[PDB]
Amino acid sequence: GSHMAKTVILDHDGNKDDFVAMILLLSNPKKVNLIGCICTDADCFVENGFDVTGKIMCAMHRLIKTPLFPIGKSTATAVNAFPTEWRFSAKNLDDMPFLNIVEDVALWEKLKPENEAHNGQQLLADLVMKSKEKVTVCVTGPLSNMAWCIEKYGEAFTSKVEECVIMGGAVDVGGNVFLPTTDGSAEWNIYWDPPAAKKVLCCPNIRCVLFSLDATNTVPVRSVDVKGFGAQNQYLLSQMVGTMWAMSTAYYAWDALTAAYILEPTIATLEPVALDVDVSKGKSEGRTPRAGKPCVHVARNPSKQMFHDLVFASTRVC
Amino acid sequence: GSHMAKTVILDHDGNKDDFVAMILLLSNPKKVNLIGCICTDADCFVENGFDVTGKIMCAMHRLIKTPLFPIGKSTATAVNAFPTEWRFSAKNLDDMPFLNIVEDVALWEKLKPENEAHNGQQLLADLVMKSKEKVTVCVTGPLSNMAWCIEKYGEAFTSKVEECVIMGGAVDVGGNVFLPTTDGSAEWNIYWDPPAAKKVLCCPNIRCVLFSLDATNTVPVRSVDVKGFGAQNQYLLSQMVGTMWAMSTHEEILRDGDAYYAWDALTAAYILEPTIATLEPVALDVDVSKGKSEGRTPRAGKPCVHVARNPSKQMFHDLVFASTRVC
Ligand SMILES: OC[C@@H]1[C@@H](O)[C@@H](O)CN1Cc1csc2c(O)ncnc12
Ligand SMILES: OC[C@@H]1[C@@H](O)[C@@H](O)CN1Cc1csc2c(O)ncnc12
Ligand SMILES: [Ca+2]
Ligand SMILES: [Ca+2]
Ligand code: NI
Ligand code: NI
Ligand code: NI
Ligand code: NI
Ligand code: NI
Ligand code: NI
Ligand code: NI
Ligand code: NI
Ligand code: NI
Ligand code: NI
Ligand code: NI
């Protein structure tokens, strides 16, 4: 009732917050058994996302003996691509000193070829279907990999999912996709691939917990807080997350909060809502307005203090 | 004949490379006695640049007992302001973990108020004029502070300057100021204040060594190199420079060959190793017009500056990595 770690897969798109989320999960083996990561060419260049995912894995394995796990690059392609400016952040992280410690680089170069052979969508399907226990899939990128799995395998996949904890959408607040051709109502992870979002969010065979902008707007990354990691600079994870956050000091802790829920389910209350995902090519493309028969459990009023305490504790692990 | 240290002041504008330059100088006390820093509100927000300068000073002082020194915010104002996107980098650095170690933050808070009372221009004039030995001023921001000192004090100031080693200009290559109102021939530190550059660069009373884009184009900040700092991650100065560089390695790809270069770091490296580049005497005709060529430093004649040529990539590399193993 404690002593059994949730079995988890992180399905992410390699920006700074995706990696803070990965650190939260992987640094808490008591609560989380991370059996796999998928990386999608969305808010990153996938090769950089792949390398950074690899090196973080290796670093934690060295320091706290968390298991190694398979990592796969998804071949999903954008309906609507992220701005290039944003996508470079995983390149920067790849070059960071904390991600080039010689032992980690040596292990990753050894492990990289086997992982290079994986297809990400197929890996997500295989990890979930072979798992002994039901799996919690943490989706911090677009929903394309989940959608592919559901379409290809149906019940054989969805029956093995405990729940899907998703960062995406904006229900009662504005979105964050501000383009000449959009109205500002949509959120980027949905907008990257709306039909995939529509297939997963309102899939009747799966429990979705949704961290939409409604909740994530509540946890901006701010200097006053980020400065706190200096007191912890001896810990590699504090160097990692302090730097990720300092490069960002808004930028919100979007994906990190989503992973925090898996660690502490009381962090937010949940509201069942039926959503009508806009898959049109109009200016409201990607919107997730209230539709009815509930699609998702929307996170509400996340605890800033609980979040804060969890991030700072986790970054003292090593 | 080789065993002495040069007295140096760093006059900078607080972007990432300005701080690598500062680390190079301050980490080499055998070669350099850093007696002061000036920070200008150019390629940074000055309050951030001030704080980062402070915390780097304190960190070195803790680790290797380099002296503390006065720091002053210049009140110089732009003729042409820097893009805001670029000026945030010192805010990011101010929030980094390697610049919030509790002992360093405590010392800086104690030292800040005395330093806050300085005027940057006046401090530059005072440090140079009181110094026992002639001073090398390393200028890695705009030339506004040097210009002010020359104009206010003349030879009382300039007679005390050993030489002025400057990052700025583009002589035989294109510039880096790309605006709807400019032609691309100008470099940003000149462009920020062209009359100040014209006053200092062709001041007949001072030796200027110029690291213009000609030389700096040769040292782009590249992933394959920056990854090297990981082998040195136990050293705080490797964390610092590795991060500053790793925040910068994407620009070459994003901007189609227009890299983030080690501009100011190479300029400081010259002070540490004068053989890193050869020098060519050139007369320059600084364009102070309001046309699209504003800030250009074309060849004019009676030499203004000694322009750095063909810097040694390997020497630079070896100097950066050794300096970052100091602590
Ligand atoms: O919409 C939030 C999702 C989260 O999964 C983050 O990884 C960023 N991602 C896209 C995104 C929206 S604004 C924004 C930004 O400003 N910079 C980088 N990425 C983003
Ligand atoms: O012209 C080079 C001088 C050097 O002193 C650097 O500090 C940046 N600075 C301005 C500058 C030019 S391009 C560029 C850039 O791309 N990012 C930030 N700063 C700059
Ligand atoms: Ca993401
Ligand atoms: Ca500068
Ligand atoms: Ni138990
Ligand atoms: Ni092992
Ligand atoms: Ni495999
Ligand atoms: Ni459109
Ligand atoms: Ni705290
Ligand atoms: Ni000597
Ligand atoms: Ni002391
Ligand atoms: Ni004073
Ligand atoms: Ni603004
Ligand atoms: Ni190699
Ligand atoms: Ni391009």
CATH number at residue B81: 3.90.245.10
| CA angle at B46 for the pair B43 and B48, rounded to the nearest 5° | 100
How many beta carbons lie within 10 A of that of residue A302, not counting itself? 24
Distance CA A215, CA A182 (A): 22
Q: In a 3-state reduction of DSSP, which class is residue A66? A: coil
A298-to-A9, A165, A278 alpha-carbon distances in Å: 20, 10, 18
Distance CA A257, CA A308 (A): 10
Write out the H or E segment, with its range, that includes residue B306. strand B305-309
| CA angle at A231 for the pair A225 and A233, rounded to the nearest 5° | 105
Sequence-separated (6 or more) residues with CB below 8 Å from residue B227: A95, A100, A105
Strands B6-12 and B32-39: parallel
Please answer yes or no on whether A97 and B229 come within 8 Å at the CB atom.
yes
The breaks in chain B (C to N more than 2.5 Å) occur after 300
CB-CB contact of A261 with A165 (8 Å):
yes
Query: Is B13 annotated in some ligand binding site?
Result: yes
Query: Is B104 annotated in some ligand binding site?
Result: no
Going from the Cα of A48 to the center of ligand 1, the distance in angstroms, rounded, reads: 17
Chain A residues touching residue B254 (CB < 8 angstroms): 84-85, 88
Distance CA A14, CA A22 (A): 10
Strands A135-139 and A161-167: parallel
Domain that holds residue B235: 1-327
**Amino acid letter, B260:** Y
Say which of A7, A15, A40, A43 is annotated catalytic: A43
Say which of A75, A86, A217, A249 is annotated catalytic: A86
List of long-range contacts for A289-295, beta carbons under 8 Å, 24+ apart = A289/A171, A289/A185, A290/A171, A290/A172, A293/A204, A295/A201, A295/A202, A295/A208
B139-to-B13, B40, B197, B244, B263 alpha-carbon distances in Å: 9, 11, 11, 19, 11
Distance CA B146, CA B90 (A): 23
Chain A residues touching residue B95 (CB < 8 angstroms): 223, 226-227, 242, 245-246, 249
Largest CA distance in chain B: 55
- Smallest Cβ–Cβ distance between B249 and the set A92, A243, A246 belongs to A92
Sequence-separated (6 or more) residues with CB below 8 Å from residue A203: A150, A158
Q: Tokens at residue A42, please?
A: 């969305």
**Residue B103, Cα to own-chain centre: how many angstroms?**
26
Q: What are phi and psi of B201, to 5 degrees?
A: -60, -40
CB-CB contact of B128 with B9 (8 Å):
yes
User: How many Å lie between the alpha carbon of B38 and the closest alpha carbon of chain A?
Assistant: 24
CB-CB contact of B144 with B151 (8 Å):
no
Distance CA A232, CA B100 (A): 9
Helices (H), chain A: 16-26, 46-64, 84-87, 89-94, 102-116, 120-130, 144-153, 155-158, 188-192, 194-201, 213-216, 223-226, 236-246, 254-263, 304-314
CB-CB contact of A60 with A66 (8 Å):
yes
CB-CB contact of B64 with B325 (8 Å):
no
Q: What are phi and psi of B52, to 5 degrees?
A: -70, -40
Helices (H) and strands (E) in chain B, counts: 16, 8
CB-CB contact of B40 with B76 (8 Å):
yes
Distance CA B298, CA B283 (A): 9
Q: Tokens at residue A299, please?
A: 């996170």
Q: Give residue for tokens 């394995």.
A: A61
User: How many Å lie between the alpha carbon of B100 and the closest alpha carbon of chain A?
Assistant: 4
Sequence-separated (6 or more) residues with CB below 8 Å from residue B116: B73
Please answer yes or no on whether A230 and B91 come within 8 Å at the CB atom.
no
Strand partners, B73: B39
Sequence-separated (6 or more) residues with CB below 8 Å from residue A267: A257, A260, A261, A302, A303, A306, A307, A310
The residue among B82, B174, B88, B143 whose CA lies nearest residue B304 is B143
Strand partners, A21: none
Q: What are phi and psi of A53, to 5 degrees?
A: -60, -45
Q: What is the DSSP string of A108-120?
A: HHHHHHHHHT-BH
User: How many Å lie between the alpha carbon of A32 and the closest alpha carbon of chain B?
Assistant: 27
CB-CB contact of A143 with A197 (8 Å):
yes
Atom number, ligand 1, closest to the C-alpha of residue A258: 5
- The number of domains in chain A is 1
B241-to-B17, B54, B56 alpha-carbon distances in Å: 9, 16, 11
Considering only CA atoms, give the Rg of chain A.
18
| Structural resolution in Å | 2.2
Strand partners, B39: B12, B73
Strand partners, A290: A275
The residue among A93, A231, A227, A20 whose CA lies nearest residue B93 is A227
- With b for 16 or more beta-carbon neighbours within 10 A and e for fewer, the B170-202 pattern comes to bbeeebbbeeeebeebbbbbbbbbbebbbbbbb
Distance CA A296, CA A215 (A): 14
How many beta carbons lie within 10 A of that of residue B156, not counting itself? 12
Strands B135-139 and B161-167: parallel
**Closest chain B residue to A222 measured between Cα atoms?**
B95
Distance CA A299, CA A165 (A): 10
Distance CA B322, CA B144 (A): 33
CB-CB contact of A11 with A38 (8 Å):
yes
Residue nearest to ligand 1 atom 20, measured at CA: A86
Strands A269-273 and A296-300: antiparallel
DSSP 8-class letter at A1: -
Chain A residues touching residue B232 (CB < 8 angstroms): 97
Strands B135-139 and B6-12: parallel
Please answer yes or no on whether B254 and A88 come within 8 Å at the CB atom.
yes
B151-to-A6, A9, B143, B195, B201 alpha-carbon distances in Å: 71, 66, 12, 12, 13
| CA angle at A301 for the pair A297 and A306, rounded to the nearest 5° | 110
Please answer yes or no on whether A95 and B249 come within 8 Å at the CB atom.
yes
Distance CA B108, CA B191 (A): 33
Q: What is the DSSP string of A8-53?
A: EEEEE--SHHHHHHHHHHHT-TTTEEEEEEEE-SSSS-HHHHHHHH
Considering only CA atoms, give the Rg of chain B.
18
